[PDB]
């Protein structure tokens, strides 16, 4: 989907835009023999706030075989905590420190 | 005559005794030690203090070895290509000076 | 003797360069322990014999 | 009886993982889990492949 500058500057207030944003972290390296780019890819639109609020994990691949890719995201520990029921039956995370 | 013979009589005498003349594989066939500091094959060190003997150095056959290898095909198909650009004027070319 | 020469020669000209073939990575529990001690994570599906 | 509830097996949640894949990445080695471990861990491994 594409958004020309005009439409961002003139769209009705209260309408909901649907922007797209590349996570280009999974772009593999270019060949050593790929022709040079004389030009320059450019970008205009950016968010004012974090956008990856729903994001649990990122870049499930190895950099090398053992290194983590920069910007890779592990799942939060809380997603796995499955603690207990409370004395009254509410869900609880496991105690952090033993006490 | 049995110079090539690694093993012999792979059967049990009784169930537990070895048949007379039965031949176990030499330990060296299984040693798969290491690469040397420079990459030559080496048997494992015998005693803990001594260095591992190069496999090529002795007359044993070792059927397990470390082999260095590329993880995937080197021919990726991204062959090098160049922009040749010819002289503008043949008469202007400077043959001179080496 | 000619055989030996042609063997020597054929070795002298072996320009083979190994690339990793298909390889399995057994879970440790799937293997008998004696095999698992020898195995090092992955191994070629065409294990030779030893 | 009044049908106060909605008895159901294998409940679905309010939240679920969604996942986008770049299909060009694939590990060369083929992991071989036991059939049981694949019965448990399978749908997870398949999704966060």
């Amino acid at each position: 989907q594409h958004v020309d500058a005009e439409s961002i500057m003139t769209a009705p207030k209260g309408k909901l835009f649907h922007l797209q944003f590349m996570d280009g972290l999974l772009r593999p390296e270019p060949s050593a023999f790929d022709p040079p780019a004389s030009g320059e890819d450019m970008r205009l639109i950016y968010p004012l706030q974090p956008i990856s609020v729903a994001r649990s994990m990122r870049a499930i691949v190895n950099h090398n075989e053992v290194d983590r890719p920069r910007g890779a995201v592990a799942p939060s520990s809380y997603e796995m905590d499955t603690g207990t029921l409370s004395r009254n039956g509410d869900l609880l995370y496991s105690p952090v420190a033993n006490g | 005559i049995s110079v090539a013979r690694s093993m012999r009589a792979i059967v049990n005498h009784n169930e537990v005794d070895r048949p007379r003349g039965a031949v176990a594989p030499s330990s060296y066939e299984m040693d798969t030690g290491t690469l040397s500091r420079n990459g030559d094959l080496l048997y494992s060190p015998v005693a803990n203090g001594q260095v591992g003997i190069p496999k090529l150095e002795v007359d044993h056959i070792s059927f397990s070895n470390v082999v260095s290898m590329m993880t995937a095909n080197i021919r990726t198909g991204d062959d090098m290509a160049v922009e040749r650009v010819n002289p503008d004027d043949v008469r202007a070319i400077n043959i001179r000076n080496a | 003797v000619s055989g030996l020469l042609m063997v020597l020669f054929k070795v002298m000209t072996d320009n083979r360069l190994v690339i990793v073939g298909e390889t399995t990575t057994p879970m440790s529990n799937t293997l008998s322990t004696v095999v698992n001690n020898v195995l090092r994570t992955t191994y070629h599906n065409n294990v030779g014999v030893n | 009886l009044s049908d106060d509830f909605k008895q159901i097996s294998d409940p679905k949640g309010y939240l679920t993982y969604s996942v986008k894949y770049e299909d060009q990445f694939t590990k060369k080695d083929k992991l071989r889990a036991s059939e049981a471990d694949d019965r448990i861990v399978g749908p997870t491994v398949n999704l966060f492949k």
């Binding site: 972290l25 999974l26 772009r27 593999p28 390296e29 870049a59 691949v61 190895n62 950099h63 090398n64 075989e65 890719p69 | 993880t71 995937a72 095909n73 021919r75 198909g77 | 083979r16 690339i19 073939g21 065409n46 030779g48 014999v49 | 060009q24 990445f25 694939t26 590990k27 060369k28």
Partner: peptide
Amino acid sequence: KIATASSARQADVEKPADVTFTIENV
């Protein structure tokens, strides 16, 4: 039945390297 003998020898499989287009690491 007659007693018999038979041989074997380990097979070759040395194929030319496969040309994959997938890649393991970023």
